[PDB]
Design an enzyme around this catalytic site. Structure first.
Site, PDB file in Angstrom:
ATOM      1  CG  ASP A  78      -1.939   1.123   1.247  1.00 23.68           C
ATOM      2  OD1 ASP A  78      -1.905   2.003   0.353  1.00 23.68           O
ATOM      3  OD2 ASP A  78      -2.738   1.281   2.104  1.00 23.68           O
ATOM      4  CB  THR A  79       1.855   3.530  -2.831  1.00 22.30           C
ATOM      5  OG1 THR A  79       0.506   3.555  -3.283  1.00 22.30           O
ATOM      6  CG2 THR A  79       2.692   2.569  -3.374  1.00 22.30           C
ATOM      7  N   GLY A  80      -0.248   3.965  -0.456  1.00 23.76           N
ATOM      8  CA  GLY A  80      -1.041   5.085   0.322  1.00 23.76           C
ATOM      9  C   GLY A  80      -1.079   4.796   1.948  1.00 23.76           C
TER      10      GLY A  80
HETATM   11  C1  0ZR Z   1      -9.941   4.033  -0.228  1.00 22.63           C
HETATM   12  C2  0ZR Z   1     -10.597   2.857  -0.176  1.00 22.63           C
HETATM   13  C3  0ZR Z   1     -11.221   2.160  -1.348  1.00 22.63           C
HETATM   14  C4  0ZR Z   1     -11.839   2.765   1.158  1.00 22.63           C
HETATM   15  O1  0ZR Z   1      -9.693   1.543   0.516  1.00 22.63           O
HETATM   16  C5  0ZR Z   1      -8.902   1.527   1.521  1.00 22.63           C
HETATM   17  O2  0ZR Z   1      -8.811   2.302   2.506  1.00 22.63           O
HETATM   18  N1  0ZR Z   1      -7.857   0.654   1.663  1.00 22.63           N
HETATM   19  C6  0ZR Z   1      -6.916   0.443   2.482  1.00 22.63           C
HETATM   20  C7  0ZR Z   1      -6.483  -0.946   3.165  1.00 22.63           C
HETATM   21  C8  0ZR Z   1      -7.752  -1.907   3.482  1.00 22.63           C
HETATM   22  C9  0ZR Z   1      -8.450  -2.696   2.145  1.00 22.63           C
HETATM   23  C10 0ZR Z   1      -9.585  -3.199   2.462  1.00 22.63           C
HETATM   24  C11 0ZR Z   1     -10.159  -3.368   3.566  1.00 22.63           C
HETATM   25  C12 0ZR Z   1      -9.468  -2.668   4.575  1.00 22.63           C
HETATM   26  C13 0ZR Z   1      -8.416  -1.947   4.533  1.00 22.63           C
HETATM   27  C14 0ZR Z   1      -5.720   1.225   2.445  1.00 22.63           C
HETATM   28  O3  0ZR Z   1      -5.006   0.667   1.334  1.00 22.63           O
HETATM   29  C15 0ZR Z   1      -5.997   2.803   2.159  1.00 22.63           C
HETATM   30  N2  0ZR Z   1      -4.821   3.651   2.049  1.00 22.63           N
HETATM   31  C16 0ZR Z   1      -4.747   4.732   2.829  1.00 22.63           C
HETATM   32  C17 0ZR Z   1      -5.560   5.683   2.363  1.00 22.63           C
HETATM   33  C18 0ZR Z   1      -5.756   6.829   3.404  1.00 22.63           C
HETATM   34  C19 0ZR Z   1      -4.568   7.683   3.332  1.00 22.63           C
HETATM   35  C20 0ZR Z   1      -4.427   9.037   3.944  1.00 22.63           C
HETATM   36  C21 0ZR Z   1      -5.549   9.481   4.718  1.00 22.63           C
HETATM   37  C22 0ZR Z   1      -6.625   8.530   4.733  1.00 22.63           C
HETATM   38  C23 0ZR Z   1      -6.589   7.338   4.023  1.00 22.63           C
HETATM   39  C24 0ZR Z   1      -4.695   4.447   4.306  1.00 22.63           C
HETATM   40  O4  0ZR Z   1      -5.368   3.719   5.064  1.00 22.63           O
HETATM   41  N3  0ZR Z   1      -3.717   5.033   4.765  1.00 22.63           N
HETATM   42  C25 0ZR Z   1      -3.430   4.929   6.501  1.00 22.63           C
HETATM   43  C26 0ZR Z   1      -2.885   3.381   6.682  1.00 22.63           C
HETATM   44  C27 0ZR Z   1      -2.368   3.333   8.160  1.00 22.63           C
HETATM   45  C28 0ZR Z   1      -1.098   3.874   8.521  1.00 22.63           C
HETATM   46  N4  0ZR Z   1      -0.944   4.077   9.768  1.00 22.63           N
HETATM   47  O5  0ZR Z   1      -0.257   4.127   7.676  1.00 22.63           O
HETATM   48  C29 0ZR Z   1      -2.034   5.919   6.495  1.00 22.63           C
HETATM   49  O6  0ZR Z   1      -1.390   6.427   6.191  1.00 22.63           O
HETATM   50  N5  0ZR Z   1      -2.549   6.222   7.966  1.00 22.63           N
HETATM   51  C30 0ZR Z   1      -1.651   7.557   8.337  1.00 22.63           C
HETATM   52  C31 0ZR Z   1      -2.180   9.002   7.889  1.00 22.63           C
HETATM   53  C32 0ZR Z   1      -3.462   9.347   8.422  1.00 22.63           C
HETATM   54  C33 0ZR Z   1      -3.456  10.085   9.565  1.00 22.63           C
HETATM   55  C34 0ZR Z   1      -4.890  10.542  10.000  1.00 22.63           C
HETATM   56  C35 0ZR Z   1      -5.955  10.191   9.605  1.00 22.63           C
HETATM   57  C36 0ZR Z   1      -5.773   9.511   8.200  1.00 22.63           C
HETATM   58  C37 0ZR Z   1      -4.802   8.994   7.754  1.00 22.63           C
HETATM   59  C38 0ZR Z   1      -1.455   7.493   9.848  1.00 22.63           C
HETATM   60  N6  0ZR Z   1      -0.493   7.918  10.445  1.00 22.63           N
HETATM   61  O7  0ZR Z   1      -2.638   7.125  10.426  1.00 22.63           O
END
Ligand code: 0ZR
EC number: 3.4.23.16
Lengths: 99, 99
Positions: A25-27
């Site tokens: 996951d690049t996101g």
């Molecule tokens: C977008 C969609 C269609 C609803 O799919 C998913 O969410 N798929 C997620 C995986 C998944 C698939 C199926 C079932 C369950 C889960 C993941 O790939 C999505 N990628 C990113 C999307 C994203 C990016 C930025 C903001 C919001 C959302 C993600 O969750 N990223 C999280 C992953 C968890 C992590 N700790 O890395 C992230 O980077 N979070 C950061 C940034 C952040 C902070 C605060 C709020 C939101 C996000 C964090 N430090 O918590």
């Protein structure tokens, strides 16, 4: 390898002596795995994504192998619906997005 | 282009004649954008991510340019933390993961 995105980019990883399937996951800033035990100390953390936040345990300096590529990094463990390999480890195996 | 992952893969997209910043997300099946106005009728969809599910509005055959690459596909609109470009559009611009 070149991984197409026609299907979810799922790969096998090896961590703490267990083989698991995980999504590249690049996101994702971090690598988050479903509940499991890991060695060492850990600290709580809240991470967010679509749907909100979840609380996880943060373990540092964890060895992981993804497609034969060994990496070292922080691994979060918690109620994630899927195992996720985030940017912190994707960089270590030399993974890039190309188009 | 080749995008490394030492930083979030944020790019500029153009939709409805307006530029916005979006995250190239290989872990996302779909493309989810923050609240905005889009033409036509929409259908309901529930999507799940890291902390649960959210309800979004589904718009089909929407024109969207990503890094200069034109795509026309399904765009979901809802309470997403950031604009996410998922595999449905990453495939249209010919993106792959490589290591
Ligand atoms: C977008 C969609 C269609 C609803 O799919 C998913 O969410 N798929 C997620 C995986 C998944 C698939 C199926 C079932 C369950 C889960 C993941 O790939 C999505 N990628 C990113 C999307 C994203 C990016 C930025 C903001 C919001 C959302 C993600 O969750 N990223 C999280 C992953 C968890 C992590 N700790 O890395 C992230 O980077 N979070 C950061 C940034 C952040 C902070 C605060 C709020 C939101 C996000 C964090 N430090 O918590």
């Amino acid at each position: 390898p070149q991984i197409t995105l026609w299907q979810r980019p799922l790969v096998t990883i090896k961590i703490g002596g267990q083989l698991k399937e995980a999504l590249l996951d690049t996101g994702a800033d971090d690598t988050v795995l479903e509940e499991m035990s890991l060695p060492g100390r850990w600290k709580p953390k809240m991470i967010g994504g679509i749907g909100g936040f979840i609380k996880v345990r943060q373990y540092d300096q964890i060895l992981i192998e993804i497609c034969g590529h060994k990496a070292i990094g922080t691994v979060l463990v918690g109620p994630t619906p899927v195992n996720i390999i985030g940017r912190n480890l994707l960089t270590q195996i030399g993974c890039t997005l190309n188009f």
